[PDB]
Design a binder for these strands. Structure first.
Lengths: 308, 282, 61, 48, 125
RNA sequence: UGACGGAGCCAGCGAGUCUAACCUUGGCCGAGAGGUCUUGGUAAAAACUCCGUCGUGCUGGGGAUAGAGCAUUGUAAUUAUUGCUCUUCAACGAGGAAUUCCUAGUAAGCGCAAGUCAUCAGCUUGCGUUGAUUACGUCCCUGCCCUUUCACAC
RNA sequence: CAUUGGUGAGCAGCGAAGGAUUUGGUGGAUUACUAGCUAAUAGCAAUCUAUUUCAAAGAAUUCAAACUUGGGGGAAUGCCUUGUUGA
RNA sequence: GUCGACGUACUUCAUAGGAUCAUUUCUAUAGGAAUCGUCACUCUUUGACUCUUCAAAAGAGCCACUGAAUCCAACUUGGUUGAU
C-alpha cells in the first residue's frame, strides 16, 4: 500500500479485506487474488479541530486526517470508521461514497472539538485558556499540581496538564440490531436506527394506504394485508396485521410471503419478540418461517445474519 | 527496520568501545575484593582513589556465551540458510544438500541471481539466524562462510580434503536427528569463539540416546569434521562413518555480516609474517 | 539547533509514528527513536527531497 | 566516507538546502564564481 | 512559474523521471517523441496510460520523461509507471480530486503496477 | 532451435605515480657499457529489435591425407605447374542403460568486470540484462521423527 | 540543443469614465439574544448619606491545623520533642 | 604447577622554607593600604528595544468600512538649443 496501515477489517464473507491508512484512504483488496477492488478517499470528510496549544491551523494540522479503526457491516455493504478526530464516518463500499457523518462531541471542555477558536481568548501572553489557574482554588487537593513533564496520557497519581482530546478508539457494528458503538472520550456512543421515525416506502403504489391495509385486514386477506403493510413499511401497521393474523393462517401466510419482504418480517420479529409478551405466538411465527424458507436463508447467510 | 538495525549496531559498537575501560575498572575492583578478603594492603593508587572506594559500596554486588549470542542461547533454535556461489555446479549443489542435511534446522536455497545485500536483508526480515555460503573450484568445495544475524560474526573457512557421501556411500539415508557435538582441542580465545559460532548452529539439548555424533577436532589449526553413528554394545561403542569428511581452516573473522566489508576484523590469517610457522592460533 | 527543533515541533512538523507531537517536553524511548520522523506534507520534507532531486509528487512528498 | 554515506539519515534538514543545488546526476553543484552570476540589464548596459 | 509535477517510475535498475507541466500536448521521452519508443512490440505498454483515460486528459499538459538504467523491458515499464503517476499527481495538484480519483480507479482496474512499484524481493522459506 | 551483411538501441559492479609479450633482419654512435633507428615473424555490453540477402531436406554435412583418371596451362604435365572429378582414411548429425539435482526474478540464456593474506587463473568470484513450464497437494510408496502419563467442550 | 535560471524589450488574447501588489486603524462575528447601579421583596439613575443607627442574632476542635520537603551524610548555636531544676 | 624456599632483576613510596586568601573586625600577624551624603564631562563594557542576514518555518484565520505606500496606464511639465 502507498502509506502506513493503521486499521484493518475483514468482510464477513471473508473474500475481501479493508484497510485504513495514514494518507486518509480506505482501500479494499480481494484475498484470493491480491487485487485492489476498491478505494475510498476519506481525508476531506474528517472534521479535525484545533487545540488550544496549537500554533498551526486545523486545516494545516495533520494530527487526525486519518482513521485508526474501521469495521464492516455484517452484510458487508457498509464500513464505519473513526479515529483521533471529531468525526465518525459511514461509507457504502460498492459505491465508495459517504452515507452519513457524525460529530463525536460538542464539548468545549474537550480539546479538538472546534476547528476555529474565539480570538478574544488570544492575548499578547497567549491563550487565556492555557493560564494555570489552579492556584485560585479553595482546597489544597485542588491546588496541587502532580504532573510529570511530557507525559502523553498521565496516570492515576499524575494528572496531565493539557485537557482531554476528543478521539474514537474502536468502532463496531452490532451483530443483532441496526446500531453501532464507538469507544470515545466521553464513553460509549451507541447510535441506533428506529424505523418508527422515517417514512420509507418499498414498491409503493397509489392503491396502497393504511386504510386499504386495514380494509384488507377486515376482508381477511391476510397475505395481501401483510404485503401492503411491508410496502408501506410502517411498524405500527406491520404489528397490527401481524397480530391480527390467526394461528391457523400462519403457515399459509408464512409459506406465501414473497422472498423480498422476508428479511423485513425476520427483522421485525427479531426486534419485536424480545420485549413482547406473546412468546408462543412469536415462536409459532418463527417456526412457520423457518419451515417455509430455511433454505433461502441458508443461501443468503450475510443478507439474513443480523435478523437470524 | 532500517532505522532499528543501524541504531542497534551503533549501540553494539559502543558497548565494544566501553568494554575496555569496563574491564580495567574490573581489575581495579578485583584488587579491592582480594584485599578485603585477605586483609592485604591496597596499592597507592587504589588507596588514594577516593571515588573508586566510594563506588565500591555500590559495585560490590557484581559478578559464558558471547555478546552476539547471549540473548537467545538455548531459548530459540537457529534457522540456517545454505546457499552457494553465483553459478553452482552439480557437485557443489550436492555438497550444499549435504551441508543442509548436516545442520538440523537448515534449508538449501538456490542462489540464482541473488545479490548479497538483498539476500542479507531477506534473511534479516525472514528471521533466519545464520547464512552459510559455499564456494568451489571445478566441483571441489574450497570455502565455507558462516555469517550470524542481524549483526553477528562472519567466519570464513578454507575447506580441504573434502569427501562426500555421494562418493563414499553407495546407499543409505542420513538419520536427521539432533546430534551430539564434540569440540576437541580448542584452547585459546579464538578457539572458544569458533566453538561458540559452530555450536550455535545446532539445536539446544539433544536427548541422551541420540546416535548421531558430529565432531570438530582441532589439529594444528585445522578442524576435522566427522559425522558418525554409534551403537552401545556391551563390549564397547562401534562407530560408523555416515557423513562427509572435510578439514576446515579459519582465515578470517569479522565483526559484521557478510555484506559489510568495512566490518572490523577480530582475526585474520597472516601468511607472510616471519614467525608465522611457529604459532598455532586456534 | 535544539531551539530550531523546538520551533519545528510546535509548528506541527514532527510525528512519532502516526501521531503528531507538538509537545517539546515529550520523552523519547530508545525503541521510540526509530519512528521519530518528519510528518508528510511538510515543507521541510519537501525541501529536503527537492534538494536531493528526489521529490515524487504522487507520494504527496 | 563510505561509513558516513551508509549512516546518513534521510530525514536530516539544513537551512542551506535552500541555497545549495544538486544536478541531475545526483551530485552537488558548486559555483565557480559564486561566494551573483547573473547581471541585470542595468549593469549590462553600462558595461557594454 | 508554470504548474509542474515531478514523479518517478522504477523497474529493476531502470529509473524514469516524468515532469508533467502545463502545456499543449507534447509527450516526449528522452528528448524524442513517445511514438518512437522502442521496441515496436512493446510500444503499447508505453501507450496504455494514454489510451486507458483518453488523449483529452493529455490535451492540456506536457509530459517529459528521462529514463536511465536497465534494459528495454525494464525501461518500458518504468516509463509507463512514471507517466501514470504523473497524470494522477498533476490532476490532484492542479485539477480536481474527482478527476484524480477517477484516474486512479481506471489505472488500478487495469494494472496496479502502473501506480505502485512491483518489488520482487526474495522470500526465504 | 539458421547464416550473412546494414541500421536502431539498453546495464550494473570496478579507479595505488599504478596495467604489463617475446624472438628477428640490419644502419649508425660508442674505449666499453650500451644507445638510437630499421626489418620480419609469433603470444595475447552481449542480447534484443528492424531491414536486406542466401536458403532449409540421407537429397548426410564437413575434415583430411595420399593416389589415380581426365583436362586447363604449358619448354617440360615426370615434377597431379595446377584445375576438376572419382577413389582412398578416420571421426561425427543433440547423445543408451543407469544415476543425480531442482519450485519465482527460480530453471535456463547473455555478456561485463574484479583477482582482495586462505582458495583460484587448466580458473575463481562478482555484477547487471532477458526470464519461464510444472507443483505449492498428500502421507498411498520410500525414509526420518514423535507420542501413547484450568474454564467450556471432547 | 536544454534551461521546471535571472534581468528585460515587445505581440496575440483579455478588457465599461483604470488595473495590480502591500499595509496601518476601527467595527461585526468567532457558544444560544431576559437591559445599568446599589446596602437589593426595593431604591437610584440629578442620587441619598440631616433616620443609617438601635435592638436581636452571633465565640467547638475548647488554636486540631506544612496532606505543600530533590538525593546521601551530618545539627556548634537555633527549632522541635521528652525529661529535669528552681520559682 | 595461578606450588613453596633461596638467589636475582624490577616497580612504587621522600620531605622542606616562605607568602597570600578563607571568621559580615580578627585565619594569630602589630614592619600593613584603604572611615568623607554627587555636581558635571569624557571614554569603555553590558542588556533591552526597532529592523535584518545566514534562512527558513508557522500564521486566532473571516467579512465590512476607513487611511497610507509601491508598480503600471493615462494626463501635466522639462528635454537632441542635451533627458539619464
Amino acid at each position: 500500500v502507498y502509506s502506513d496501515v493503521l486499521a484493518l477489517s475483514m468482510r464477513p464473507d471473508g473474500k475481501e479485506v479493508a484497510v485504513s491508512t495514514l494518507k486518509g484512504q480506505i482501500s479494499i483488496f480481494n484475498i484470493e487474488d491480491a487485487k485492489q477492488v476498491g478505494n475510498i478517499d476519506c481525508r476531506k470528510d474528517i472534521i479535525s479541530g484545533r487545540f488550544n496549544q496549537d500554533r498551526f491551523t486545523a486545516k494545516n494540522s495533520e494530527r487526525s486526517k486519518f482513521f485508526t479503526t474501521i469495521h464492516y457491516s455484517f452484510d458487508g455493504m457498509a464500513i464505519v470508521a473513526g479515529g483521533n478526530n471529531n468525526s465518525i464516518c459511514l461509507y457504502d463500499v460498492p459505491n465508495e461514497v459517504l452515507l452519513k457523518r457524525f460529530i463525536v462531541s460538542r464539548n468545549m471542555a474537550l480539546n479538538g472539538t472546534l476547528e476555529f477558536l474565539n480570538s478574544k481568548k488570544m492575548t499578547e501572553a497567549g491563550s487565556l485558556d492555557l493560564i494555570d489557574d489552579a492556584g485560585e482554588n479553595s482546597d489544597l487537593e485542588d491546588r496541587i499540581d502532580n504532573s510529570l513533564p511530557g507525559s502523553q496520557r498521565g496516570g492515576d497519581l499524575s494528572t496531565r496538564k493539557m485537557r482531554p482530546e476528543v478521539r474514537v478508539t474502536s468502532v463496531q457494528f452490532s451483530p443483532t440490531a441496526n446500531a453501532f458503538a464507538a469507544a470515545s472520550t466521553e464513553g460509549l456512543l451507541i447510535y441506533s436506527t428506529n424505523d418508527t421515525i422515517l417514512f420509507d416506502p418499498f414498491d409503493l403504489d397509489v392503491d396502497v394506504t393504511p386504510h386499504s391495509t386495514v380494509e384488507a385486514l377486515r376482508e381477511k386477506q391476510f397475505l395481501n394485508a401483510l404485503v401492503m403493510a411491508f410496502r408501506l413499511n410502517e411498524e405500527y401497521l406491520i404489528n397490527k396485521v401481524y397480530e391480527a393474523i390467526p394461528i391457523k393462517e400462519i403457515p399459509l401466510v408464512a409459506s406465501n410471503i414473497p422472498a423480498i419482504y422476508l428479511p423485513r418480517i425476520l427483522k421485525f420479529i427479531g426486534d419485536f419478540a424480545i420485549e413482547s409478551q406473546h412468546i408462543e405466538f412469536n415462536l409459532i411465527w418463527i417456526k412457520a418461517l423457518l419451515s417455509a424458507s430455511g433454505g433461502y436463508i441458508n443461501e443468503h447467510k450475510y443478507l439474513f445474519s443480523t435478523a437470524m | 527496520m532500517l532505522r532499528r538495525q543501524a541504531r542497534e549496531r551503533r549501540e553494539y559498537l559502543y558497548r565494544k568501545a566501553q568494554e575496555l575501560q569496563d574491564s580495567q575498572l574490573q581489575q581495579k575492583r578485583q584488587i579491592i575484593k582480594q584485599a578485603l578478603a585477605q586483609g592485604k594492603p591496597l596499592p597507592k593508587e587504589l588507596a588514594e582513589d577516593e571515588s573508586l572506594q566510594k563506588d565500591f559500596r555500590y559495585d560490590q554486588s557484581l559478578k559464558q556465551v558471547d555478546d552476539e549470542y547471549a540473548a537467545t542461547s538455548g531459548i530459540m533454535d537457529p534457522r540456517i540458510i545454505v546457499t552457494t556461489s553465483r553459478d553452482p555446479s552439480t557437485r557443489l549443489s550436492q555438497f550444499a544438500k549435504e551441508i543442509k542435511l548436516l545442520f538440523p534446522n537448515a534449508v538449501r536455497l538456490n542462489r540464482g541471481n541473488y545479490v548479497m545485500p538483498n539476500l542479507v536483508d531477506a534473511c534479516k526480515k525472514s528471521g533466519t539466524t545464520d547464512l552459510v555460503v559455499l564456494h568451489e573450484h571445478r566441483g571441489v568445495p574450497t570455502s565455507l562462510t558462516i555469517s550470524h544475524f542481524p549483526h553477528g560474526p562472519t567466519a570464513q573457512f578454507s575447506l580441504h580434503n573434502v569427501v562426500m557421501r555421494h562418493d563414499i556411500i553407495n546407499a543409505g539415508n542420513q538419520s536427521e536427528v539432533n546430534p551430539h557435538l564434540i569440540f576437541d582441542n580448542f584452547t585459546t580465545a579464538l578457539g572458544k569463539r569458533v566453538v561458540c559460532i559452530l555450536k550455535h548452529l545446532f539445536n539446544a539439548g539433544p536427548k541422551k540416546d541420540s546416535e548421531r555424533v558430529i565432531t570438530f577436532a582441532n589439529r594444528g589449526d585445522f578442524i576435522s569434521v566427522r559425522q558418525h553413528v554409534y551403537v552401545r554394545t556391551r563390549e564397547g561403542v562401534e562407530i560408523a562413518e555416515v557423513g562427509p569428511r572435510f578439514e576446515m581452516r579459519l582465515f578470517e573473522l569479522r565483526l559484521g555480516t557478510l555484506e559489510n566489508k568495512d566490518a572490523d576484523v577480530e582475526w585474520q590469517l597472516r601468511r607472510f609474517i616471519r614467525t608465522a610457522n611457529k604459532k598455532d592460533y586456534l | 539547533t535544539i531551539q530550531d527543533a523546538v520551533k519545528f515541533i510546535e509548528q506541527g512538523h514532527v510525528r512519532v509514528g502516526p501521531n503528531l507531537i507538538n509537545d517539546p517536553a515529550y520523552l523519547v524511548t530508545r525503541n521510540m527513536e526509530d519512528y521519530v520522523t518528519w510528518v508528510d506534507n511538510s515543507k521541510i520534507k519537501k525541501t529536503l527531497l527537492r534538494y536531493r532531486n528526489q521529490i515524487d509528487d504522487f507520494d504527496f512528498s | 566516507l563510505r561509513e558516513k554515506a551508509k549512516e546518513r539519515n534521510p530525514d536530516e534538514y539544513y537551512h542551506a538546502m535552500h541555497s545549495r543545488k544538486t544536478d541531475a546526476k545526483g551530485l552537488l553543484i558548486s559555483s565557480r564564481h559564486g561566494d551573483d552570476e547573473s547581471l541585470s540589464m542595468d549593469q549590462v548596459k553600462l558595461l557594454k | 512559474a508554470v504548474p509542474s509535477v515531478q514523479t518517478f517510475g522504477k523497474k529493476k535498475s531502470a529509473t524514469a523521471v516524468a515532469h508533467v507541466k502545463a502545456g499543449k500536448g507534447l509527450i516526449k521521452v528522452n528528448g524524442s517523441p513517445i511514438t518512437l519508443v522502442e521496441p515496436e512490440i512493446l510500444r503499447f505498454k508505453v501507450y496504455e496510460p494514454l489510451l486507458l483515460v483518453g488523449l483529452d486528459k493529455f490535451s492540456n499538459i506536457d509530459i517529459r520523461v528521462r529514463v536511465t538504467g536497465g534494459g528495454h523491458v525494464s525501461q518500458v515499464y518504468a516509463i509507463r509507471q512514471a507517466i501514470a503517476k504523473g497524470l494522477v499527481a498533476y490532476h490532484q495538484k492542479y485539477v480536481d480530486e474527482q478527476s484524480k480519483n477517477e484516474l486512479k480507479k481506471a489505472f488500478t482496474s487495469y494494472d496496479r503496477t502502473l501506480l505502485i512499484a512491483d518489488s520482487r524481493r526474495p522470500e526465504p522459506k
